[PDB]
Write a structure and sequence with these properties.
The structure is a homodimer.
Chain A lengths: L1 E3 L5 H4 L5 E7 L5 E3 L2 H4 L2 E2 L6 H10 L28 H6 L3 H11 L1 H10 L22 E2 H12 L7 H10 L1 E4 L3 E10 L5 E11 L2 E11 L7 H13 L4
Parallel strand pairs in A: 1-3
Antiparallel strand pairs in A: 2-3, 2-9, 4-5, 6-7, 7-8, 8-9
PDB class: hydrolase
Keywords: antibiotic resistance, hydrolysis of amide bond of beta-lactam compounds, hydrolase
Assembly: dimeric
Chain lengths: 242, 241
Protein backbone atom coordinates (compact mmCIF):
# COMPACT_ATOMS: atom_id res chain seq x y z
CA UNK A 1 0.00 0.00 0.00
CA UNK A 2 2.65 2.60 0.97
CA UNK A 3 6.28 3.28 0.05
CA UNK A 4 8.71 5.70 1.70
CA UNK A 5 10.57 8.33 -0.46
CA UNK A 6 13.25 10.08 1.54
CA UNK A 7 14.44 12.13 -1.42
CA UNK A 8 11.33 14.31 -0.87
CA UNK A 9 12.89 15.60 2.38
CA UNK A 10 14.99 17.81 0.05
CA UNK A 11 11.88 19.96 -0.43
CA UNK A 12 11.40 20.23 3.37
CA UNK A 13 14.98 21.06 4.27
CA UNK A 14 15.62 24.55 2.83
CA UNK A 15 12.79 25.96 4.97
CA UNK A 16 13.48 23.53 7.82
CA UNK A 17 9.95 22.08 7.69
CA UNK A 18 8.78 19.18 9.85
CA UNK A 19 5.97 17.65 7.80
CA UNK A 20 4.59 14.80 5.72
CA UNK A 21 3.19 14.43 2.19
CA UNK A 22 1.09 11.40 1.23
CA UNK A 23 0.37 11.04 -2.53
CA UNK A 24 -1.65 8.19 -4.14
CA UNK A 25 -2.36 7.37 -7.80
CA UNK A 26 -5.90 6.07 -8.51
CA UNK A 27 -6.59 4.65 -5.04
CA UNK A 28 -5.19 4.52 -1.47
CA UNK A 29 -3.78 1.12 -2.46
CA UNK A 30 -0.74 2.78 -4.07
CA UNK A 31 0.63 5.63 -1.97
CA UNK A 32 4.02 7.18 -1.38
CA UNK A 33 5.15 9.34 1.50
CA UNK A 34 8.38 11.00 2.69
CA UNK A 35 7.82 9.80 6.31
CA UNK A 36 5.90 6.59 7.20
CA UNK A 37 5.76 7.45 10.90
CA UNK A 38 4.27 10.93 10.49
CA UNK A 39 1.96 9.81 7.63
CA UNK A 40 -0.01 7.81 10.24
CA UNK A 41 0.23 10.31 13.11
CA UNK A 42 -3.09 12.04 13.92
CA UNK A 43 -3.32 15.84 14.16
CA UNK A 44 -6.11 18.33 14.77
CA UNK A 45 -7.97 18.78 11.45
CA UNK A 46 -8.75 22.52 11.86
CA UNK A 47 -10.59 23.82 8.73
CA UNK A 48 -10.12 20.58 6.82
CA UNK A 49 -13.03 19.47 9.04
CA UNK A 50 -15.25 21.74 6.93
CA UNK A 51 -15.40 18.87 4.42
CA UNK A 52 -17.20 16.29 6.58
CA UNK A 53 -19.07 19.09 8.44
CA UNK A 54 -20.58 20.40 5.19
CA UNK A 55 -21.62 16.92 4.08
CA UNK A 56 -23.24 16.20 7.50
CA UNK A 57 -24.94 19.70 7.39
CA UNK A 58 -26.47 18.75 4.02
CA UNK A 59 -27.41 15.17 5.02
CA UNK A 60 -29.28 16.40 8.13
CA UNK A 61 -30.99 19.30 6.31
CA UNK A 62 -29.16 21.86 8.45
CA UNK A 63 -27.82 23.20 5.17
CA UNK A 64 -30.70 23.49 2.65
CA UNK A 65 -28.74 23.05 -0.64
CA UNK A 66 -25.73 24.41 -2.46
CA UNK A 67 -27.46 27.77 -2.95
CA UNK A 68 -28.01 28.61 0.70
CA UNK A 69 -26.67 32.00 1.68
CA UNK A 70 -25.17 32.37 5.14
CA UNK A 71 -25.94 35.98 6.20
CA UNK A 72 -23.59 38.02 8.36
CA UNK A 73 -25.65 39.55 11.23
CA UNK A 74 -23.32 42.55 11.68
CA UNK A 75 -21.52 41.25 14.79
CA UNK A 76 -17.71 41.64 14.31
CA UNK A 77 -15.77 38.48 13.42
CA UNK A 78 -12.24 37.12 13.94
CA UNK A 79 -11.45 37.88 10.26
CA UNK A 80 -12.22 40.77 7.89
CA UNK A 81 -12.76 38.15 5.09
CA UNK A 82 -15.65 36.54 7.07
CA UNK A 83 -17.63 39.81 7.50
CA UNK A 84 -20.03 39.47 4.49
CA UNK A 85 -22.78 37.14 3.29
CA UNK A 86 -21.34 33.84 1.93
CA UNK A 87 -22.52 30.92 -0.21
CA UNK A 88 -21.67 27.38 0.86
CA UNK A 89 -18.60 27.37 -1.43
CA UNK A 90 -17.57 30.82 -0.21
CA UNK A 91 -17.87 29.76 3.46
CA UNK A 92 -15.72 26.66 2.79
CA UNK A 93 -13.09 28.54 0.68
CA UNK A 94 -12.60 31.53 3.05
CA UNK A 95 -12.66 28.98 5.90
CA UNK A 96 -15.46 30.94 7.77
CA UNK A 97 -15.29 29.41 11.28
CA UNK A 98 -18.47 30.95 12.85
CA UNK A 99 -20.70 29.72 9.95
CA UNK A 100 -19.55 26.13 10.62
CA UNK A 101 -19.81 26.52 14.39
CA UNK A 102 -23.50 27.26 13.92
CA UNK A 103 -23.83 24.31 11.47
CA UNK A 104 -22.18 22.06 14.11
CA UNK A 105 -24.52 23.24 16.91
CA UNK A 106 -27.58 22.49 14.69
CA UNK A 107 -26.19 19.05 13.71
CA UNK A 108 -25.72 18.32 17.46
CA UNK A 109 -23.38 15.93 19.36
CA UNK A 110 -25.36 12.71 18.79
CA UNK A 111 -25.58 13.01 15.02
CA UNK A 112 -22.02 14.41 14.69
CA UNK A 113 -20.72 11.35 16.62
CA UNK A 114 -22.59 8.92 14.37
CA UNK A 115 -21.43 10.55 11.08
CA UNK A 116 -17.76 10.52 12.05
CA UNK A 117 -18.18 6.78 12.83
CA UNK A 118 -19.80 6.24 9.36
CA UNK A 119 -17.00 8.23 7.70
CA UNK A 120 -14.27 6.51 9.81
CA UNK A 121 -12.92 10.01 10.52
CA UNK A 122 -9.72 9.91 12.62
CA UNK A 123 -10.02 9.21 16.37
CA UNK A 124 -13.71 10.25 16.13
CA UNK A 125 -13.27 12.23 19.39
CA UNK A 126 -15.61 15.20 19.49
CA UNK A 127 -15.18 16.18 23.12
CA UNK A 128 -14.36 19.83 23.93
CA UNK A 129 -17.70 21.47 22.91
CA UNK A 130 -19.88 20.85 19.86
CA UNK A 131 -18.78 24.13 18.19
CA UNK A 132 -15.01 23.76 18.76
CA UNK A 133 -13.81 20.14 18.82
CA UNK A 134 -11.98 20.41 15.42
CA UNK A 135 -10.40 23.75 16.36
CA UNK A 136 -9.29 23.26 19.94
CA UNK A 137 -10.70 19.93 21.17
CA UNK A 138 -9.62 16.32 20.97
CA UNK A 139 -10.39 15.36 17.36
CA UNK A 140 -7.32 14.09 15.47
CA UNK A 141 -6.86 12.55 11.96
CA UNK A 142 -3.74 11.36 10.00
CA UNK A 143 -2.72 12.28 6.50
CA UNK A 144 -3.34 8.67 5.43
CA UNK A 145 -6.88 8.81 6.89
CA UNK A 146 -7.52 12.15 5.08
CA UNK A 147 -6.61 10.48 1.75
CA UNK A 148 -8.87 7.50 2.47
CA UNK A 149 -11.81 9.82 3.32
CA UNK A 150 -11.25 11.98 0.19
CA UNK A 151 -11.05 8.85 -2.03
CA UNK A 152 -14.44 7.75 -0.67
CA UNK A 153 -15.88 11.23 -1.41
CA UNK A 154 -14.43 11.25 -4.89
CA UNK A 155 -16.10 7.88 -5.62
CA UNK A 156 -19.43 8.86 -3.92
CA UNK A 157 -18.88 6.04 -1.47
CA UNK A 158 -19.40 7.93 1.82
CA UNK A 159 -22.67 7.18 3.68
CA UNK A 160 -24.40 10.23 2.29
CA UNK A 161 -26.45 10.89 -0.85
CA UNK A 162 -24.58 11.17 -4.19
CA UNK A 163 -26.19 14.60 -4.48
CA UNK A 164 -24.70 15.96 -1.26
CA UNK A 165 -21.22 14.49 -2.10
CA UNK A 166 -21.38 16.16 -5.50
CA UNK A 167 -22.39 19.46 -3.97
CA UNK A 168 -19.45 19.44 -1.56
CA UNK A 169 -17.09 18.37 -4.36
CA UNK A 170 -18.02 21.43 -6.46
CA UNK A 171 -17.45 23.61 -3.42
CA UNK A 172 -13.93 22.22 -3.16
CA UNK A 173 -12.72 23.15 -6.70
CA UNK A 174 -9.70 25.48 -6.32
CA UNK A 175 -7.94 25.35 -9.69
CA UNK A 176 -9.38 24.79 -13.12
CA UNK A 177 -6.91 24.44 -16.02
CA UNK A 178 -7.40 23.11 -19.48
CA UNK A 179 -5.35 19.87 -18.70
CA UNK A 180 -6.25 19.35 -15.03
CA UNK A 181 -8.67 20.19 -12.17
CA UNK A 182 -7.75 20.54 -8.47
CA UNK A 183 -10.11 20.09 -5.50
CA UNK A 184 -8.52 21.06 -2.22
CA UNK A 185 -8.82 22.47 1.28
CA UNK A 186 -6.39 24.19 3.67
CA UNK A 187 -6.30 24.10 7.46
CA UNK A 188 -4.31 25.89 10.16
CA UNK A 189 -4.79 24.52 13.68
CA UNK A 190 -3.83 27.54 15.82
CA UNK A 191 -5.31 26.13 19.07
CA UNK A 192 -2.84 23.26 19.33
CA UNK A 193 0.97 23.28 19.86
CA UNK A 194 2.92 23.01 17.67
CA UNK A 195 0.29 24.48 15.33
CA UNK A 196 -0.53 22.28 12.36
CA UNK A 197 -0.97 23.33 8.74
CA UNK A 198 -2.81 21.17 6.20
CA UNK A 199 -3.47 20.98 2.48
CA UNK A 200 -5.48 18.05 1.29
CA UNK A 201 -7.39 17.20 -1.89
CA UNK A 202 -7.06 15.51 -5.24
CA UNK A 203 -6.00 16.29 -8.82
CA UNK A 204 -7.57 14.99 -12.00
CA UNK A 205 -5.28 15.25 -15.05
CA UNK A 206 -6.17 13.56 -18.41
CA UNK A 207 -7.77 10.24 -17.45
CA UNK A 208 -5.99 9.80 -14.07
CA UNK A 209 -6.67 10.95 -10.45
CA UNK A 210 -4.15 11.55 -7.59
CA UNK A 211 -5.19 11.94 -3.92
CA UNK A 212 -2.88 13.89 -1.53
CA UNK A 213 -2.60 15.07 2.00
CA UNK A 214 0.04 17.38 3.34
CA UNK A 215 0.64 18.56 6.91
CA UNK A 216 3.46 20.44 8.69
CA UNK A 217 4.29 22.22 11.94
CA UNK A 218 3.71 26.00 11.68
CA UNK A 219 5.30 28.24 14.36
CA UNK A 220 4.85 31.55 12.53
CA UNK A 221 2.25 32.79 10.09
CA UNK A 222 4.92 33.66 7.48
CA UNK A 223 5.38 29.88 6.83
CA UNK A 224 1.68 29.28 5.80
CA UNK A 225 2.24 29.31 2.03
CA UNK A 226 4.57 26.27 2.35
CA UNK A 227 1.54 24.11 3.03
CA UNK A 228 0.65 24.50 -0.69
CA UNK A 229 4.04 25.19 -2.26
CA UNK A 230 5.92 22.11 -0.91
CA UNK A 231 3.33 19.57 -2.15
CA UNK A 232 2.72 21.53 -5.41
CA UNK A 233 6.45 21.35 -6.17
CA UNK A 234 6.39 17.56 -5.58
CA UNK A 235 3.27 17.06 -7.73
CA UNK A 236 4.63 19.30 -10.51
CA UNK A 237 7.98 17.32 -10.64
CA UNK A 238 5.90 14.18 -11.30
CA UNK A 239 3.71 15.89 -13.98
CA UNK A 240 0.52 15.69 -11.86
CA UNK A 241 0.01 19.44 -11.85
CA UNK A 242 1.10 21.49 -14.87
CA UNK B 1 -34.77 42.98 -21.40
CA UNK B 2 -33.22 46.45 -21.95
CA UNK B 3 -30.73 47.76 -24.53
CA UNK B 4 -27.37 49.26 -23.63
CA UNK B 5 -26.12 50.72 -26.90
CA UNK B 6 -22.74 51.73 -25.35
CA UNK B 7 -21.73 48.02 -25.29
CA UNK B 8 -21.56 48.28 -29.08
CA UNK B 9 -18.13 49.99 -28.77
CA UNK B 10 -16.56 46.63 -27.85
CA UNK B 11 -17.77 45.07 -31.11
CA UNK B 12 -16.81 47.98 -33.41
CA UNK B 13 -13.37 48.17 -31.69
CA UNK B 14 -12.81 44.64 -33.10
CA UNK B 15 -14.58 45.02 -36.49
CA UNK B 16 -17.19 42.35 -35.69
CA UNK B 17 -21.00 41.80 -35.70
CA UNK B 18 -22.56 40.22 -32.63
CA UNK B 19 -24.66 40.19 -29.48
CA UNK B 20 -24.07 40.01 -25.71
CA UNK B 21 -26.90 39.13 -23.31
CA UNK B 22 -26.24 39.57 -19.59
CA UNK B 23 -28.66 38.91 -16.71
CA UNK B 24 -28.25 39.72 -13.01
CA UNK B 25 -29.90 37.24 -10.53
CA UNK B 26 -32.35 35.75 -13.01
CA UNK B 27 -33.55 36.06 -16.63
CA UNK B 28 -36.09 38.69 -15.45
CA UNK B 29 -33.40 41.47 -15.44
CA UNK B 30 -31.33 41.36 -18.60
CA UNK B 31 -29.48 43.81 -20.84
CA UNK B 32 -28.10 43.51 -24.38
CA UNK B 33 -26.30 45.63 -26.99
CA UNK B 34 -28.78 44.56 -29.68
CA UNK B 35 -32.37 43.70 -28.91
CA UNK B 36 -32.98 42.05 -32.29
CA UNK B 37 -29.91 39.84 -32.48
CA UNK B 38 -30.52 38.81 -28.81
CA UNK B 39 -33.53 36.84 -30.02
CA UNK B 40 -32.18 35.61 -33.36
CA UNK B 41 -31.52 31.85 -33.45
CA UNK B 42 -28.17 30.44 -34.62
CA UNK B 43 -26.63 26.99 -34.95
CA UNK B 44 -25.45 26.15 -31.44
CA UNK B 45 -22.21 24.33 -32.50
CA UNK B 46 -20.22 22.99 -29.51
CA UNK B 47 -22.44 24.86 -27.03
CA UNK B 48 -24.68 21.85 -27.71
CA UNK B 49 -22.31 19.75 -25.64
CA UNK B 50 -24.15 21.03 -22.57
CA UNK B 51 -27.60 19.55 -23.26
CA UNK B 52 -26.01 16.52 -25.06
CA UNK B 53 -23.95 15.67 -21.92
CA UNK B 54 -27.03 15.94 -19.64
CA UNK B 55 -29.05 13.80 -22.07
CA UNK B 56 -26.18 11.25 -22.29
CA UNK B 57 -26.19 10.92 -18.49
CA UNK B 58 -30.01 10.85 -18.15
CA UNK B 59 -30.46 8.05 -20.70
CA UNK B 60 -27.51 6.10 -19.24
CA UNK B 61 -25.48 6.35 -22.48
CA UNK B 62 -22.89 8.06 -20.23
CA UNK B 63 -22.53 5.61 -17.28
CA UNK B 64 -21.41 8.15 -14.63
CA UNK B 65 -19.08 11.12 -14.09
CA UNK B 66 -15.89 9.03 -14.18
CA UNK B 67 -16.59 7.42 -17.56
CA UNK B 68 -13.53 7.42 -19.80
CA UNK B 69 -14.20 7.78 -23.55
CA UNK B 70 -11.50 5.59 -25.19
CA UNK B 71 -9.91 6.68 -28.44
CA UNK B 72 -10.11 3.79 -30.97
CA UNK B 73 -7.07 4.45 -33.16
CA UNK B 74 -8.62 5.96 -36.31
CA UNK B 75 -7.44 9.56 -37.04
CA UNK B 76 -9.47 12.60 -35.95
CA UNK B 77 -10.04 16.17 -37.24
CA UNK B 78 -7.79 17.38 -34.36
CA UNK B 79 -4.78 15.47 -32.90
CA UNK B 80 -5.78 17.02 -29.51
CA UNK B 81 -8.83 14.68 -29.81
CA UNK B 82 -6.55 11.67 -30.34
CA UNK B 83 -6.49 10.31 -26.76
CA UNK B 84 -8.74 8.88 -24.07
CA UNK B 85 -10.89 11.64 -22.49
CA UNK B 86 -13.04 12.18 -19.44
CA UNK B 87 -16.38 14.00 -19.79
CA UNK B 88 -14.74 17.18 -18.63
CA UNK B 89 -11.73 16.56 -20.87
CA UNK B 90 -13.95 16.01 -23.94
CA UNK B 91 -16.05 19.05 -23.01
CA UNK B 92 -12.99 21.17 -22.29
CA UNK B 93 -11.29 20.29 -25.59
CA UNK B 94 -14.69 20.06 -27.45
CA UNK B 95 -13.92 16.58 -28.91
CA UNK B 96 -16.69 16.41 -31.55
CA UNK B 97 -16.35 12.60 -32.25
CA UNK B 98 -17.01 11.75 -28.58
CA UNK B 99 -20.26 13.68 -28.69
CA UNK B 100 -21.25 12.28 -32.05
CA UNK B 101 -21.20 8.74 -30.56
CA UNK B 102 -23.21 9.90 -27.57
CA UNK B 103 -25.81 11.46 -29.92
CA UNK B 104 -25.97 8.19 -31.92
CA UNK B 105 -26.69 6.03 -28.87
CA UNK B 106 -29.12 8.60 -27.52
CA UNK B 107 -31.02 8.29 -30.83
CA UNK B 108 -33.45 10.61 -32.58
CA UNK B 109 -36.61 10.01 -30.53
CA UNK B 110 -34.96 10.50 -27.12
CA UNK B 111 -32.95 13.55 -28.31
CA UNK B 112 -36.15 15.13 -29.64
CA UNK B 113 -38.01 14.41 -26.36
CA UNK B 114 -35.30 16.03 -24.17
CA UNK B 115 -34.93 19.11 -26.36
CA UNK B 116 -38.68 19.61 -25.97
CA UNK B 117 -38.44 19.24 -22.19
CA UNK B 118 -35.42 21.64 -22.20
CA UNK B 119 -37.28 24.16 -24.49
CA UNK B 120 -34.08 24.20 -26.52
CA UNK B 121 -34.31 26.67 -29.45
CA UNK B 122 -36.31 25.66 -32.58
CA UNK B 123 -35.91 21.98 -31.48
CA UNK B 124 -35.16 20.99 -35.07
CA UNK B 125 -32.75 18.06 -35.12
CA UNK B 126 -32.82 17.53 -38.90
CA UNK B 127 -29.58 16.97 -40.77
CA UNK B 128 -28.38 13.66 -39.25
CA UNK B 129 -28.38 12.38 -35.66
CA UNK B 130 -24.65 13.08 -35.39
CA UNK B 131 -24.44 16.44 -37.16
CA UNK B 132 -27.61 18.42 -36.57
CA UNK B 133 -25.95 20.89 -34.13
CA UNK B 134 -22.90 21.38 -36.38
CA UNK B 135 -24.36 21.56 -39.87
CA UNK B 136 -28.06 20.74 -39.58
CA UNK B 137 -31.18 22.70 -38.87
CA UNK B 138 -30.88 23.28 -35.06
CA UNK B 139 -31.04 26.97 -34.04
CA UNK B 140 -31.02 28.73 -30.63
CA UNK B 141 -30.93 32.41 -29.56
CA UNK B 142 -28.67 34.08 -26.89
CA UNK B 143 -31.80 34.81 -24.82
CA UNK B 144 -32.85 31.15 -24.92
CA UNK B 145 -29.30 30.04 -23.97
CA UNK B 146 -29.49 32.22 -20.84
CA UNK B 147 -32.94 30.75 -19.96
CA UNK B 148 -31.59 27.21 -20.39
CA UNK B 149 -28.44 27.88 -18.28
CA UNK B 150 -30.52 29.49 -15.56
CA UNK B 151 -32.58 26.30 -15.35
CA UNK B 152 -29.38 24.20 -15.22
CA UNK B 153 -27.96 26.48 -12.42
CA UNK B 154 -31.23 25.96 -10.42
CA UNK B 155 -31.33 22.19 -11.08
CA UNK B 156 -34.69 22.87 -12.78
CA UNK B 157 -34.14 20.94 -16.05
CA UNK B 158 -36.04 17.60 -16.50
CA UNK B 159 -33.06 15.57 -15.47
CA UNK B 160 -31.85 14.33 -12.09
CA UNK B 161 -30.16 16.86 -9.82
CA UNK B 162 -27.16 14.56 -9.72
CA UNK B 163 -26.70 14.64 -13.54
CA UNK B 164 -27.13 18.43 -13.62
CA UNK B 165 -24.40 18.75 -10.89
CA UNK B 166 -22.04 16.43 -12.82
CA UNK B 167 -22.32 18.47 -16.02
CA UNK B 168 -21.94 21.74 -14.08
CA UNK B 169 -18.62 20.55 -12.64
CA UNK B 170 -17.42 19.63 -16.13
CA UNK B 171 -18.14 23.29 -17.21
CA UNK B 172 -16.14 25.04 -14.46
CA UNK B 173 -13.54 27.26 -16.19
CA UNK B 174 -12.36 29.81 -13.56
CA UNK B 175 -12.27 29.47 -9.79
CA UNK B 176 -11.32 31.74 -6.89
CA UNK B 177 -12.74 31.64 -3.28
CA UNK B 178 -15.72 33.94 -4.01
CA UNK B 179 -15.74 33.88 -7.85
CA UNK B 180 -16.66 30.91 -10.00
CA UNK B 181 -17.25 30.71 -13.76
CA UNK B 182 -19.01 27.92 -15.68
CA UNK B 183 -18.75 28.43 -19.42
CA UNK B 184 -18.62 26.84 -22.85
CA UNK B 185 -17.40 28.05 -26.26
CA UNK B 186 -18.72 27.18 -29.72
CA UNK B 187 -17.71 27.55 -33.39
CA UNK B 188 -20.30 26.77 -36.07
CA UNK B 189 -18.29 26.08 -39.25
CA UNK B 190 -21.09 24.12 -40.94
CA UNK B 191 -23.38 27.11 -41.66
CA UNK B 192 -22.92 30.52 -43.32
CA UNK B 193 -21.92 32.96 -42.04
CA UNK B 194 -20.03 30.98 -39.39
CA UNK B 195 -21.19 31.59 -35.75
CA UNK B 196 -18.90 31.87 -32.64
CA UNK B 197 -20.33 31.51 -29.13
CA UNK B 198 -19.44 31.89 -25.51
CA UNK B 199 -22.15 31.10 -22.89
CA UNK B 200 -22.21 30.50 -19.15
CA UNK B 201 -22.60 32.05 -15.74
CA UNK B 202 -20.58 33.88 -13.12
CA UNK B 203 -21.04 33.46 -9.40
CA UNK B 204 -19.47 36.45 -7.62
CA UNK B 205 -19.87 36.53 -3.78
CA UNK B 206 -23.67 35.89 -3.38
CA UNK B 207 -24.77 37.20 -6.82
CA UNK B 208 -25.04 35.24 -10.08
CA UNK B 209 -24.87 36.58 -13.62
CA UNK B 210 -26.01 34.58 -16.65
CA UNK B 211 -24.51 35.42 -20.06
CA UNK B 212 -24.63 34.48 -23.73
CA UNK B 213 -22.49 35.92 -26.52
CA UNK B 214 -22.47 35.23 -30.23
CA UNK B 215 -20.78 36.76 -33.28
CA UNK B 216 -20.15 36.20 -36.99
CA UNK B 217 -16.80 34.42 -37.45
CA UNK B 218 -14.97 34.87 -40.79
CA UNK B 219 -12.25 32.35 -39.92
CA UNK B 220 -10.27 30.95 -36.98
CA UNK B 221 -8.25 34.13 -36.29
CA UNK B 222 -11.25 35.95 -34.70
CA UNK B 223 -12.22 33.10 -32.26
CA UNK B 224 -10.48 34.74 -29.23
CA UNK B 225 -13.03 37.61 -29.36
CA UNK B 226 -15.78 35.18 -28.11
CA UNK B 227 -14.14 35.71 -24.70
CA UNK B 228 -12.50 39.14 -24.81
CA UNK B 229 -15.60 41.16 -25.87
CA UNK B 230 -17.85 39.71 -23.07
CA UNK B 231 -14.97 40.16 -20.62
CA UNK B 232 -14.65 43.87 -21.37
CA UNK B 233 -18.40 44.33 -21.16
CA UNK B 234 -18.55 42.51 -17.83
CA UNK B 235 -15.62 44.59 -16.63
CA UNK B 236 -17.36 47.87 -17.47
CA UNK B 237 -20.31 46.54 -15.49
CA UNK B 238 -18.17 46.06 -12.34
CA UNK B 239 -18.42 42.25 -12.37
CA UNK B 240 -14.75 41.39 -12.95
CA UNK B 241 -12.93 43.88 -10.68
Amino acid sequence: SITENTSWNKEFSAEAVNGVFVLCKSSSKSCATNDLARASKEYLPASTFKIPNAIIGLETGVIKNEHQVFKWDGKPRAMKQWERDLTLRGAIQVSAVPVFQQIAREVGEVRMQKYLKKFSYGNQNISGGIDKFWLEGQLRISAVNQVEFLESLYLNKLSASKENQLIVKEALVTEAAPEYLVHSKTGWGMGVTPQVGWWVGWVEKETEVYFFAFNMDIDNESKLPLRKSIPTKIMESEGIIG
